[PDB]
Amino acid sequence: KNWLKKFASHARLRALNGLLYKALTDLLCTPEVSQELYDLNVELSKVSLTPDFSACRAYWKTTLSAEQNAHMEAVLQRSAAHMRHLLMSQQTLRNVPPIVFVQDKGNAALAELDQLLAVADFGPRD
Amino acid sequence: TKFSIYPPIPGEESSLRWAGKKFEEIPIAHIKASHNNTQIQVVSASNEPLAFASCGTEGFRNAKKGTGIAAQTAGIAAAARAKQKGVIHIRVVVKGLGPGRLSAMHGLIMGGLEVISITDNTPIPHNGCRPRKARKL
Amino acid sequence: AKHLKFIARTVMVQEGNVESAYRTLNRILTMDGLIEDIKHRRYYEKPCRRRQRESYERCRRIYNMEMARKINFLMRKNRADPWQGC
Amino acid sequence: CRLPPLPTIREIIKLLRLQAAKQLSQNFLLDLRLTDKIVRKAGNLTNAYVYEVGPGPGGITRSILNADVAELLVVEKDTRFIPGLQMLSDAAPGKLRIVHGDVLTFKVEKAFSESLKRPWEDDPPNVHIIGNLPFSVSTPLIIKWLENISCRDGPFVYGRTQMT
Amino acid sequence: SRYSPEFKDPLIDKEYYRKPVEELTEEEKYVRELKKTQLIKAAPAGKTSSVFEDPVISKFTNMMMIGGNKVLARSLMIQTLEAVKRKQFEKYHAASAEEQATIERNPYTIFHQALKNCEPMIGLVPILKGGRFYQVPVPLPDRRRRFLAMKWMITECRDKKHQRTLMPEKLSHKLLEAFHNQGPVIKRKHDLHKMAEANRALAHYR
RNA sequence: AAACUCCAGUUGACACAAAAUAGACUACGAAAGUGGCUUUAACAUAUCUGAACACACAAUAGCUAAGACCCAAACUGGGAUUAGAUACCCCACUAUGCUUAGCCCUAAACCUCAACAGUUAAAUCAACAAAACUGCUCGCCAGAACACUACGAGCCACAGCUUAAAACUCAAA
Ligand SMILES: [K+]
Ligand SMILES: [Mg+2]
Ligand SMILES: [Mg+2]
Ligand SMILES: [Mg+2]
Ligand SMILES: [Mg+2]
Ligand SMILES: [Mg+2]
Ligand SMILES: [Mg+2]
Ligand SMILES: [Mg+2]
Ligand SMILES: [Mg+2]
């Protein structure tokens, strides 16, 4: 079909989010996407679909090192299209919107607050 | 001597021994990692069931069966029940691509058994039965 | 079933490094195409869809290889300017 | 008879608290002219007792009420349209009786008076059912009402009640 | 502001200029040459190259100020320091030989330790999102907690239940109480550190 | 949640079902189609064109008898779901998908390119599609809708398939 020309040129939403979360975790469990990505052991927190099904935001847990975070970010944006193709080819969803990898840092507040409460002084009846 | 990734063969003699036994005499831990459940059965080389543990047998219920923690607990239970029968070294035979594929092996190792080889036996038909239709979610 | 066991898809653990053995087995199954076959065999792919997918994958590979060849060929020119000013 | 205006689509969206035209999940006949055509095809309703189902905004309700019915019984499953139907009732005193509940489960054999019960062998017993319901619930209702006709009970305790 | 942006803050440190050129690092050397070209603002009344300068006590005096009356504020501060010193001497003279090694008589050490003992490490932020105020914990910055300690001390000493007890006498007593981890200021810190734990689950929201 | 608990795991025996990888190959056949292994037959024409109807074939679906039945699955039941729920998710199981002998004769049956022979010089050429043409032959088309329609005729079809108009109407399509 002239491929050279082509290349040259809500309750339902919650179920879809859960299904896509499981599918993306399953995809990341193996080197199916790439060996480099498999090495980094990316872990996902949640998957959120926009109300118009225009984009899929996958929230991946960040680490403490910054260079590792940057490398993970780069490989994830380079591999998102391959994940979309794999998801659509496996017939997990007949049409998947573009996948966007967003960093998750919500646990940082809890971690810092735990660290400070460990060393804080509550006095009598702690 | 260079380490061989390939398993030993029963015919050709080899110097690899584990606690004095040969490769084909080590017990086998069969892991079935389904999508909602994981089942571990330890058997002897002569196919004597020694221990059995699945995520449903360790109290996990419904969707909690198909998680890594549940498979780890099942692996630990099977490892304990097999350690009580004289098993130390095991050959792991995994079947399926469920969430508990690797958590069961974590549990088995954390229960004290030593894994000497990993084998995959996931059923791959050469186009036999027809699969079901894709879900229209 | 009728074959000898512990020969196919079997990996030996070195120095108790179970993680490396498992990851090597995953690499083997992925590069032999077994993982993709398992994932694709969960639901039935209609013959026309399979044909279209295979054609798209083949032509995508061809186009990507051609574009990469073009970029590598034209990368030789990318260097410091020898006639700067003019 | 002075009736309140027919709700527009925007008022319906706001009443359902949807804030969009894409999560409606329903189709409304908001043309009083087609509804008048339907009630015309329902026969001559002068001094008749109508049991309407699935009014929603109430175009069919208005069309029937303009015809000189003796009393109109409405069964609505949404509380969100009951205010509009109450305004319609205030507009027409005594000709509209609104009931909240399912049409699959409502018991009509007690709704109207016992003086309308005409023998089966005679003409249709001056009672009529008119309905513009969702297509996902109109088929169980017709099956149920066919069973009732076979047993001559339910809405057909009055006789050979006509349905539209 | 009557100072142009090119003007920079002065550095009143006296030993900083005395650092030998041998010790200077290349970045330090670079900044030392760079400062030559810059314009420097006139040093404000207050901080001096003196050896008895205490920025913390100066800030406390500034916070005790009412109506620009710095003379009275500094008078109160020096009276507080003298009262603390006299109370410690009076307690040290009446102490046994083995207790004399564990009585502090320097008022500056007592003041700094009293303010440190009252610094809260965690605080609360009012945040109305769901139509209702939700007080969530937050890690306080160091400057924030240092300010909060001073403000709690001053507000505690401005309470009206203390009638005719002059501010120097109230403030010396409160400083000596906080030196031993006692008094209402330490209880105010404790009631905040407990109310920030009783609303720990609210960190999930934020 | 229903369902099963004559259930599930290892091991052994075991299809009238469909044929991983090779295949990133682009082959065979008039088309439709054809991708597990072996063997037997076997892939017309020493000019070209030549049919809605003549003579032989035509994916999938569908219909007669007999048979097989793992899995899948129109329908049919049950489970869960808002406030007119999920038609869409889950479980069970039919016609059917398979074999033998007959029918039915339709597809976006498309490379949306009629068959053979020739040319690349021209002005290349409405646009897009797929560079522009020539010679010769058959088939077909002459505004839209009425109309993949009515009637007539034919057919293993009985509503089906092929062929296929007219009246009124419009200035457009
Ligand atoms: K085509
Ligand atoms: Mg010919
Ligand atoms: Mg002809
Ligand atoms: Mg056919
Ligand atoms: Mg058939
Ligand atoms: Mg069947
Ligand atoms: Mg079929
Ligand atoms: Mg021809
Ligand atoms: Mg016809």
PDB file of C-alpha atoms in Angstrom, chain D residues 23 29-30 40 42 46 53 56 107 111 116 122 129 137:
ATOM      1  CA  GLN D  23     -22.398  10.826  28.457  1.00  0.00           C
ATOM      2  CA  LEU D  29     -38.027  12.765  21.247  1.00  0.00           C
ATOM      3  CA  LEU D  30     -38.299  16.517  21.873  1.00  0.00           C
ATOM      4  CA  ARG D  40     -53.222  10.387  17.159  1.00  0.00           C
ATOM      5  CA  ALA D  42     -53.101   5.681  19.559  1.00  0.00           C
ATOM      6  CA  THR D  46     -61.560  11.476  24.701  1.00  0.00           C
ATOM      7  CA  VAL D  53     -44.676   4.678  30.525  1.00  0.00           C
ATOM      8  CA  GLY D  56     -38.689  11.353  30.482  1.00  0.00           C
ATOM      9  CA  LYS D 107     -49.063  -3.211  39.503  1.00  0.00           C
ATOM     10  CA  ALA D 111     -54.294   1.745  39.664  1.00  0.00           C
ATOM     11  CA  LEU D 116     -63.922   0.366  33.942  1.00  0.00           C
ATOM     12  CA  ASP D 122     -66.647  -6.640  24.410  1.00  0.00           C
ATOM     13  CA  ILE D 129     -51.220   2.223  27.302  1.00  0.00           C
ATOM     14  CA  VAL D 137     -36.612  -2.361  28.382  1.00  0.00           C
TER      15      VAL D 137
END
